[PDB]
Amino acid sequence: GPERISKAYESKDVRLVARDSAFLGLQRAIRSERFELDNFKSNFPYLTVANGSLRTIVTGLKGIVEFDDGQMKDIAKEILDTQICGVPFSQFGTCSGSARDLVDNASYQQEKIIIKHLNELFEKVALHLVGAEV
Numbered sequence: 001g002p003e004r005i006s007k008a009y010e011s012k013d014v015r016l017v018a019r020d021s022a023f024l025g026l027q028r029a030i031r032s033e034r035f036e037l038d039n040f041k042s043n044f045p046y047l048t049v050a051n052g053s054l055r056t057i058v059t060g061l062k063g064i065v066e067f068d069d070g071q072m073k074d075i076a077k078e079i080l081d082t083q084i085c086g087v088p089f090s091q092f093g094t095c096s097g098s099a100r101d102l103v104d105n106a107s108y109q110q111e112k113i114i115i116k117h118l119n120e121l122f123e124k125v126a127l128h129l130v131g132a133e134v
Contacts, residue, residue, distance in 0.1 A: 022067050025060030030129060036118075037111055044103055044111075045095035054080070054089070072131065079128055084117045 032053055039047070058080060065073035082089055103111075 019067060022060075022063040025063045026132070029057040029060045032122075032125070037108070037115055040111075045100050048093055048095050075128065075131075079124070082121055082124065084121050085114055086117075 034052055035047070037044075058076075061073075061076040061079070064076060080089065084092055106114075
Protein backbone atom coordinates (compact mmCIF):
# COMPACT_ATOMS: atom_id res chain seq x y z
CA GLY A 1 0.00 0.00 0.00
CA PRO A 2 1.70 3.02 -1.38
CA GLU A 3 -0.27 5.71 0.37
CA ARG A 4 1.10 8.62 2.35
CA ILE A 5 -0.72 11.14 4.49
CA SER A 6 0.28 14.65 5.41
CA LYS A 7 -0.93 17.03 8.07
CA ALA A 8 -3.00 19.92 6.81
CA TYR A 9 -2.19 23.49 7.69
CA GLU A 10 -4.87 26.04 8.45
CA SER A 11 -5.48 28.49 5.65
CA LYS A 12 -6.31 32.02 6.70
CA ASP A 13 -5.29 35.45 5.42
CA VAL A 14 -3.59 34.00 2.35
CA ARG A 15 -2.72 37.46 0.98
CA LEU A 16 -1.87 38.98 4.39
CA VAL A 17 0.55 36.19 5.34
CA ALA A 18 2.02 36.14 1.83
CA ARG A 19 2.65 39.88 2.04
CA ASP A 20 4.64 39.34 5.25
CA SER A 21 6.82 36.68 3.55
CA ALA A 22 7.60 39.11 0.72
CA PHE A 23 8.90 41.51 3.38
CA LEU A 24 11.50 38.94 4.55
CA GLY A 25 12.72 38.38 0.97
CA LEU A 26 13.73 42.04 0.82
CA GLN A 27 15.49 41.64 4.18
CA ARG A 28 17.92 39.00 2.78
CA ALA A 29 18.49 41.38 -0.11
CA ILE A 30 19.49 44.07 2.42
CA ARG A 31 21.85 41.83 4.45
CA SER A 32 23.86 40.66 1.42
CA GLU A 33 26.81 38.29 1.83
CA ARG A 34 29.90 38.32 -0.33
CA PHE A 35 33.54 37.51 0.31
CA GLU A 36 36.10 40.09 -0.71
CA LEU A 37 39.82 40.11 -1.56
CA ASP A 38 40.39 37.79 1.41
CA ASN A 39 39.38 34.77 -0.63
CA PHE A 40 39.44 36.50 -3.97
CA LYS A 41 43.14 36.89 -3.31
CA SER A 42 44.10 33.62 -4.92
CA ASN A 43 40.66 32.18 -5.51
CA PHE A 44 39.32 35.33 -7.20
CA PRO A 45 38.52 33.40 -10.39
CA TYR A 46 37.85 30.09 -8.63
CA LEU A 47 34.53 31.11 -7.12
CA THR A 48 32.51 32.10 -10.14
CA VAL A 49 29.15 30.71 -9.03
CA ALA A 50 27.48 29.64 -5.79
CA ASN A 51 24.22 31.64 -5.46
CA GLY A 52 26.36 34.31 -3.86
CA SER A 53 23.61 36.90 -3.79
CA LEU A 54 22.63 37.83 -7.33
CA ARG A 55 20.29 34.88 -7.75
CA THR A 56 18.89 35.01 -4.20
CA ILE A 57 18.00 38.70 -4.42
CA VAL A 58 16.50 38.04 -7.86
CA THR A 59 13.96 35.72 -6.22
CA GLY A 60 13.03 38.49 -3.78
CA LEU A 61 12.64 40.78 -6.79
CA LYS A 62 10.05 38.38 -8.25
CA GLY A 63 7.99 38.87 -5.10
CA ILE A 64 8.30 42.64 -5.65
CA VAL A 65 6.64 42.57 -9.10
CA GLU A 66 3.86 40.25 -7.83
CA PHE A 67 2.71 42.45 -4.96
CA ASP A 68 3.62 45.97 -6.06
CA ASP A 69 2.62 45.41 -9.69
CA GLY A 70 4.14 48.74 -10.71
CA GLN A 71 7.13 50.09 -12.60
CA MET A 72 9.41 48.89 -9.81
CA LYS A 73 9.59 45.55 -11.63
CA ASP A 74 11.35 47.34 -14.53
CA ILE A 75 13.88 48.87 -12.12
CA ALA A 76 14.60 45.33 -10.86
CA LYS A 77 15.76 44.27 -14.36
CA GLU A 78 18.26 47.16 -14.47
CA ILE A 79 19.66 46.06 -11.09
CA LEU A 80 20.62 42.64 -12.52
CA ASP A 81 22.53 44.24 -15.39
CA THR A 82 25.80 45.66 -14.03
CA GLN A 83 29.46 45.88 -15.03
CA ILE A 84 32.23 44.97 -12.58
CA CYS A 85 35.93 44.66 -13.44
CA GLY A 86 35.33 46.17 -16.87
CA VAL A 87 33.15 43.21 -17.78
CA PRO A 88 29.47 42.58 -17.33
CA PHE A 89 27.69 40.05 -15.12
CA SER A 90 27.78 37.75 -18.17
CA GLN A 91 31.58 37.57 -18.25
CA PHE A 92 31.84 37.53 -14.48
CA GLY A 93 30.11 34.19 -14.16
CA THR A 94 33.08 32.21 -15.43
CA CYS A 95 36.82 32.12 -15.05
CA SER A 96 39.23 32.92 -17.81
CA GLY A 97 42.94 32.09 -17.91
CA SER A 98 43.48 35.48 -19.51
CA ALA A 99 42.06 37.07 -16.40
CA ARG A 100 44.02 34.75 -14.10
CA ASP A 101 47.30 35.93 -15.60
CA LEU A 102 46.20 39.56 -15.39
CA VAL A 103 45.25 39.22 -11.72
CA ASP A 104 48.64 37.74 -10.79
CA ASN A 105 50.41 40.52 -12.72
CA ALA A 106 48.29 42.97 -10.78
CA SER A 107 49.06 43.57 -7.14
CA TYR A 108 46.93 44.33 -4.13
CA GLN A 109 46.88 48.04 -4.88
CA GLN A 110 45.59 47.14 -8.35
CA GLU A 111 42.96 44.93 -6.80
CA LYS A 112 42.03 47.92 -4.64
CA ILE A 113 40.78 49.79 -7.71
CA ILE A 114 38.96 46.61 -8.79
CA ILE A 115 37.31 46.32 -5.37
CA LYS A 116 36.27 49.92 -5.90
CA HIS A 117 34.25 48.82 -8.90
CA LEU A 118 32.57 46.58 -6.37
CA ASN A 119 32.18 49.49 -3.90
CA GLU A 120 30.17 51.59 -6.36
CA LEU A 121 28.23 48.43 -7.31
CA PHE A 122 27.19 48.14 -3.62
CA GLU A 123 26.07 51.78 -3.74
CA LYS A 124 23.71 50.97 -6.65
CA VAL A 125 22.22 48.23 -4.49
CA ALA A 126 21.59 50.89 -1.83
CA LEU A 127 19.79 52.96 -4.48
CA HIS A 128 17.14 50.23 -4.65
CA LEU A 129 17.45 50.10 -0.85
CA VAL A 130 15.87 53.57 -0.58
CA GLY A 131 12.76 52.04 -2.11
CA ALA A 132 11.45 51.52 1.41
CA GLU A 133 11.85 55.12 2.49
CA VAL A 134 9.46 56.21 -0.23
